[PDB]
Symmetry: C5
Subunit: 334 residues, 5 copies
């Protein structure tokens, strides 16, 4: 009620405070409990092999130098006072670019409790690196992790734990990913040994399953239809050389344009993927159809009966071979 008394108490708390020394310096490690409230997952980039994530990151510890008595309330202080306290050197092991939002003020919260407990919250947009195995793309399932670690203090100076157990991370169910669906999320706590000692480590893992409907409608169906159109030339009479030659070579041209424009639209991932295998299979099928017609045209004059036999065998074989190829592809990648 008396603002002067509160100011006196806060000044007494910050008088003689040393920000260069951790709580219980030279004593037991200070336990820091962390919770994450995930606001959104902005994007998942395969080209950059990373993902953007916005979250409310809250740390909870206890500095007895900040214990105050006579005020039966929790002091929610201005965020600028965070520049005058000790805060954990928490960082994100696999991030590439992170920042704290600073509009209208720096998105930061300091709340002190009578027993010296400090709650310290930030709003962070971090671009965390996520190595992806795109061999089964676009039927792939990825696993992206956020790693949280102390930078300077070892496990003899600091310890990390998830505050609230498995309920430490919230907001996962509200994440809207246009292309993925979050199958599961896991929380792990452990210690990692490096040349400078043992460091606490927290891990938050998401498992994402890609949605395939867009690719099915826009990447496979045109190729299937072009392959069927390539088959069409089998029923065309072989006397009309121009018609069948034009049909085959134009199907080849359409397949090439489809492949090039899909490769332009699809992310630039320099190795073999499932969709690339399917496109190569379709291209090989149309190439074989054109080559078969060329052979039929060449051997037609010598023996037209054998030409007709080869034509009907192609009619009965090419759809069957393509059905087998599709069955193998959709059973190997599913």
């Amino acid at each position: 009620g008396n603002m002067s008394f509160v100011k006196e108490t806060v000044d007494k708390l910050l008088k003689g405070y040393d920000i260069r020394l951790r709580p219980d310096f030279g004593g037991p490690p200070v336990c820091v409990g962390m919770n994450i409230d995930i606001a959104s997952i902005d994007m998942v980039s395969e080209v950059n092999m990373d993902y953007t994530l916005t979250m409310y990151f809250q740390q909870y510890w206890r500095d007895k130098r900040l214990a105050y008595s006579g005020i039966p309330l929790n002091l929610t202080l201005d965020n600028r006072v965070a520049d005058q306290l000790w805060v954990p050197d928490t960082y994100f092991l696999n991030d590439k670019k992170s920042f704290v939002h600073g509009v209208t003020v720096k998105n930061r919260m300091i709340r002190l409790h009578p027993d010296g407990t400090v709650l310290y919250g930030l709003r962070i947009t971090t671009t965390a690196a996520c190595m992806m195995d795109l061999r089964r793309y676009p039927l792939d399932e990825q696993n992206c992790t956020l790693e949280i670690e102390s930078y300077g203090y070892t496990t003899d100076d600091i310890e990390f734990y998830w505050r609230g157990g498995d309920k430490a991370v919230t907001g996962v169910e509200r994440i809207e990913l246009p292309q993925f669906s979050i199958v599961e999320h896991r929380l792990v706590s452990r210690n990692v040994v490096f040349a400078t000692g043992a460091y606490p480590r927290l891990s938050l893992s998401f498992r994402l399953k890609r949605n395939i409907g867009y690719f099915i409608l826009q990447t496979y169906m045109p190729s299937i239809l072009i392959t069927i159109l390539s088959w069409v030339s089998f029923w065309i009479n072989y006397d009309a050389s121009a018609a069948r030659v034009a049909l085959g070579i134009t199907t080849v041209l359409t397949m090439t344009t489809i492949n090039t424009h899909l490769r332009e639209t699809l992310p630039k991932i320099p190795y073999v993927k499932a969709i690339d295998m399917y496109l190569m299979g379709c291209f090989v099928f149309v190439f074989l159809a054109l080559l078969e017609y060329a052979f039929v045209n060449y051997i037609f004059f010598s023996q037209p009966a054998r030409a007709a036999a080869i034509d009907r065998w192609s009619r009965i074989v090419f759809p069957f071979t393509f059905s087998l190829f599709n069955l193998v592809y959709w059973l190997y990648y599913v």
Copy 2:
């Protein structure tokens, strides 16, 4: 008139002022009234699912520690004095990259009133996230919101309201979006409960309706014309096998090129859209036209009468079926 007297008054106001404590700390919550003057909406991006917004954001509160007497004027102070006062920890819940303009100085205004009232203005360019339902794109109607919330203080320490009621937000009528048109805007005030307590929340919602003339001219009309050209082969005499094969396969090639280049130009939206369904329908129609010609050519030799009957039935059916498809499409999505 006496600048020395005014300097003395300001120094007296700022002497003993604790910026770490909110006004009336430990008492009733401080009421903050907010108004927004929207300068422009820079862009709306479906790829990033966001919109850029430049605005003048003004907050109004009362701090009795700043009440001054003897000066019958409102003191417009230099913006730098804002670093020596308590300001609310207002932030935008759904933004992604917000900044305050800083040329030639930080675009910030502090005005003090004799009764302790503070007016605090900022010029903010915020890129706010907006989830978009693009199932009906480009005939879609989006709803994009700006959420305003206190970061640290709860409803026991701060309260938000729209100063001026429904006239708090201005400049909406002057917004010039090249692709959208603001149908309506709304103001909402409420409280949101989180694990740390109840927080005030203001919401500014816009409803945007997309313009369709560009898409009609540049995306649908070419497809309709190519479909009509595909029908053209029905009136061509069947004996000219080369001409009909060339026409059908070249219509297919044009349709594929159109689809690929539109997909390249269209925003990267990894799910089915209405325009995609329409393009797939046109592609299926030209594919069926080519298949029908193939069937006619195959059965022409055995019984030309049946071939002619199929040709005339195709002439009478394909325009009819395409008209039905267009009617269904333009009644479902409108």
Copy 3:
């Protein structure tokens, strides 16, 4: 020449100086005279609807607190002293991202005069928004403005004027825009009334006119040539059905590819422009040519004389109709 005396004078000037109070606080408004030296105009973006401008922006005013005697020279101080003086809160109304150059030092200049006059110069690069009416693109004329206003002070506290009258802006003649030409520039001074009062406003307007030679050589000539090639099929004998079908459908394919690649290369402007109308007109012309040939081929067998009459009428009509279309287009848009 005695640097100790000058240091004493400057320290006396800055001793007791209050940066939070404008000159003549509580008295007459302080007049600020502004001059702009435009170094360059970097770019004019149609997609983003803005232009980038680099300029030496200089503000001239009088602060009697800074008047000094005994030194018959103008004191060009280090720019850092600007952090210890009151400066106008000048900002740009329509800018989107401005910055002050800071290599090797902050590109800032402070000069003091014996009568208390302050000259304050900055080197600023600003991306100012400019809504463009691209209906007549690429034959359009744009009017892009830079607006200058006081953020916090009203006309009761500050007044703006163009120092030097019509010669307050220089370097316009030296601007090298590869695509536009600066027809004219104008200086406007006025006052703008908002809910918080009246504010001074300066406006510098440029009238840019686009150059059309590149569009003529790259965007219209290919379409005209493809239309002529479509006309070519008229003189081809109707017996060669395959030849005319291939010519017409391949002209259609070339027109589609040209349109798609031009749309990819042209700025993404989501509404109809003149060039789009021209491309659609050419597309309709080639479509009608193919339809006419189809009708001729259909009616050739029943009555070849009527088919030949239609063919020669097409030969005499299509160039004439295209000439009329071009005349209407080039007189409506010029």
Copy 4:
């Protein structure tokens, strides 16, 4: 060797030092000698009309206030001391975005000398604007300059010179430009008069010559080959009307695709270029070949002798006219 004595000497030097006043304030101008060690030229952009340049920029002047005695050594101080010293307000006239590297510390060097001489080095990555005349692109020769000027001080307060004469700028020979070769570089020193007085100016000019092999292999040879393939139709007998029509129209289509995709790959420059003229010439040649074939096909029935004469004249003329066009092109632009 006695660090306390050196610290005392430095403190005495900085005691009473006024950074707001230049050396010899009110007296003769302070001469600043500059040298540049060019680390690399990162890129040269025609689209943005600029070039990125990383360099070690060193300034050399004398400040008698910093003269020290008793230490016969050059004091290489920590870079932060530069914040406590007067440094020239040197800036780059034509830069767009410059920064000083700051990892692991700000790349800045202060070296004091017994006679008061100060050496001040920075590592700067500057994006300098360069207007390019791309009429003769890609056979062009550009001249790109870096301008160095004093922002606030005139020639009465400061003077510039290249320290070391023509050897002031080093590292030019080690520059590896993938697309350009540095023919020459020049150093210029002068004075430029603006409305505020005369300012010293240094200029460093490079003359860049573009490599042509990539364009010859990738831009001209395909066009020449497509033109030759267009000529191929002349030797084809006119009885096969479909074959010649297909050949001509497909050569036209290939030319259109080549032009559009080259324009996509070529930098976005909105005016005429030499490569554009060459592509238009090739397009006109193939267009005229198709027109000639159409005329031959039209007049073939009435009088085959004249048709064959026109065909052989085309055979003997088209290569000759194309050779003349290439000779004119390669003599005018070289």
Copy 5:
């Protein structure tokens, strides 16, 4: 255990500490031992000729002014204390844009030892320049280096060495590059003489070998198949002029589209590469095939026997010549 005693000791250490003077100023050079722990290599860019590298950079030196007694423990201090100590002016000679991570705090570590030893850790994401020889692309092998040098201090003031010998740099084996493979890494230490004297230099070099499977699947196989299709016209009977003309010209069109789209997808590298040579070889082969067919068609009427002889000679020559071309290409570059 006594925090007051530790605070007293630290304050005593920093009392009278001059950060402007290196350790042992005026005496022997201070030896700085460095170790790098590489976290990941983000990307390797052929367009920009640079690679992004994230690492933990640790420096080790001895400052006797920081030696403390009575505390038999190492002091891991808050990173902010790094602003109150001397640190080496280490920078990266070839970087273009580097930063130290700053979430949640600045990613920085200071550890002090009783004998005056300082360990200084940073987390740095640097984009280092790497000039690449893309003549043998995509069969190329690259050598990319990270250079480390002192900015202001010469070898008389500071010396660099790798702390740990060849084990100083760790994490190389765990680097995951999708496109490259790290063959070897080398650590070099030396001294480099500039005009201002000799500076210490450390170098960390990587040798990277590009993976070729993606290019074999998606860049070479389509060209080989298109060349084979161009051959297939040889077996087509030469009486069918339209079919062979269509096949040859459409193979040319597909080759052009493949080349243009690959050039668009491939990095912008404006000089000759191996893949460009292969594509030009395939283009020349299909062009020669079309020319040979044209010659056969021209000479067919005068003497069909010679035409058939040329046809069969082409059948036996073109595959052999292409096999020789492939053998030369794949033996020269491998």
